[PDB]
Design a protein around this ligand. Structure first.
Ligand SMILES: O=c1ccn([C@@H]2O[C@H](COP(=O)(O)OP(=O)(O)O)[C@@H](O)[C@H]2O)c(=O)[nH]1
Ligand SMILES: O=c1ccn([C@@H]2O[C@H](COP(=O)(O)OP(=O)(O)O)[C@@H](O)[C@H]2O)c(=O)[nH]1
Ligand SMILES: OC[C@H]1O[C@@H](O)[C@H](O)[C@@H](O)[C@H]1O
Ligand SMILES: OC[C@H]1O[C@@H](O)[C@H](O)[C@@H](O)[C@H]1O
Lengths: 264, 264
């Protein structure tokens, strides 16, 4: 492979590492051949969780189809579809080493954290996403790490005072005006099973405290996710390549790939 | 602290992440306040090993004195001085939470890997350096990670064909002309105790194989270190700030700090 050269940065237009030395994942920063070998040597299994409740079942066909094309191809994958309509889950043909479980429900942080023992035995990493999305390009093992969040596409160019963190100190999700690294979106986070269970258990515990005190954070679990990732910093951060809306935001030059996007 | 901004890289003159998403540690890439808190929360202890055999005992006073000023200040530190002259080890006054053990000898990869049980109980990380050096500036927890190597100061601008890897395929340290990420120097490596014991055990095993086959790698343990870090890629790479010789190489603009340098 091309020899990296220490005096020629690959990307000079974007921050590629956080101040706590976590990689920020952009096209041009990783050699996927290297990463694939590292992960295949450990026989890595990746769990992907998606909620499809009521009308949202309609998004599953395109979500699954495009995950088969782009999501961890070559690696073991276990999709977990949480739904109130098990009969509505479309039968999508899967590649080898890939499987799908339907988990009938009848919220997300709770549901992710009481499926606890099942995830620990079955997968090495968990990735938690929204269902009303599609994969358009590679999303692979470059994202994998103990704990990751994703830069919210509307706020990656913003100053922190503008971040819509929870601002009331009455809420467990409270973050002062002068604190904050990034604004992560709730739609794409993950990590090792142990770290995701820690995060979702914390967020759930914090939501219950707010509920008992008669307050809902301004953006619900995303507020708590942001407070958690402030205090427990992620070991990788995904760039907005990993969570985009072309309809609302276009295709800026800074995004060399649009990998996982909102459905119009 | 200053808010990192995703569209303003801190350093645009240097590669700050490897193609396998390991940070390359340069001044300007890390907020040490963040890192210090993370490590102090775990009550981190760092072991620093140094060999001072024969004449090399003379380098210990300045090495230890300047380590006290610059090396992991604020954190727990355990110096391990391997020497053939225990009475020649200078008595240097140490800061709180810091200790020094004198290990009488009567090579390095062997010696590091049979002190195995002692390191596992006493320290969380191990750092292995040459003694004929001095600390001139901060060397702290930014370096800490499961496995790290350091860019050899003479070769960081070079192409791989120029790297003085072992080129004879008869040697365990053999690396083909078209393979190779970097040229790491043997003078500064480390990691978790488990990873350093794995590395030094591998290098030792490989040296014995070469010795049994009547061959010495061209640069001895540095050759084996380079073969190991090719096949087991380091989780952080230190920039040449961490291993420099101002007499031979000056003080280039690209080096904002000279942290650990050869003694003239
Ligand atoms: O009725 C619903 C609402 C939400 N969701 C899941 O939670 C996410 C949030 O959807 P969004 O917040 O865009 O809709 P809203 O929060 O406004 O109901 C969806 O992607 C689904 O993955 C769902 O399955 N059914
Ligand atoms: O007689 C010796 C040679 C080496 N060393 C240790 O191993 C390192 C290598 O020294 P160097 O290779 O510069 O000297 P040489 O390898 O030419 O003997 C030294 O820093 C010491 O840390 C030592 O203690 N005594
Ligand atoms: O301010 C945060 C909000 O940003 C909106 O753009 C987004 O659609 C919401 O889901 C929420 O993340
Ligand atoms: O080619 C590798 C060699 O480079 C020299 O500059 C160095 O002093 C030697 O110790 C060895 O590392």
């Amino acid at each position: 492979y091309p020899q990296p050269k220490v005096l020629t940065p690959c990307r000079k237009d974007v921050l590629v590492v956080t101040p706590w030395l976590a990689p920020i994942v952009w096209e041009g920063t990783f050699n996927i051949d290297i990463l694939n070998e590292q992960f295949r040597l450990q026989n890595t299994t990746i769990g992907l969780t998606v909620f499809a409740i009521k009308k949202y079942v309609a998004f599953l066909k395109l979500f699954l189809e495009t995950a088969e094309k782009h999501f961890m191809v070559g690696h073991r994958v276990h999709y977990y579809v949480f739904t109130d309509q098990p009969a509505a889950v479309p039968r999508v043909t899967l590649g080898t080493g890939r499987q799908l479980s339907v988990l009938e429900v009848g919220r997300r942080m709770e549901m992710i954290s009481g499926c606890e023992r099942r995830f620990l035995s079955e997968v090495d990493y968990l990735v938690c996403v929204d269902v009303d999305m599609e994969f358009r390009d590679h999303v692979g093992v470059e994202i994998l790490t103990p704990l990751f969040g994703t830069l919210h596409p509307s706020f990656y160019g913003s100053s922190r005072e503008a971040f819509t963190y929870e601002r009331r100190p009455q809420s467990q999700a409270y973050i002062p005006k002068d604190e904050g690294d990034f604004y992560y979106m709730g739609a794409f986070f993950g990590g090792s099973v142990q770290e995701v269970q820690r995060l979702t258990r914390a967020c759930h515990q914090a939501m219950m405290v707010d509920q008992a005190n008669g307050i809902e954070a301004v953006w619900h679990d995303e507020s708590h996710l942001n407070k958690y990732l402030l205090r427990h910093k992620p070991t990788k951060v995904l760039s907005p390549e990993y969570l985009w809306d072309q309809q609302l935001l276009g295709w800026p030059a800074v995004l060399r790939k649009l990998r996982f996007t909102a459905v119009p």
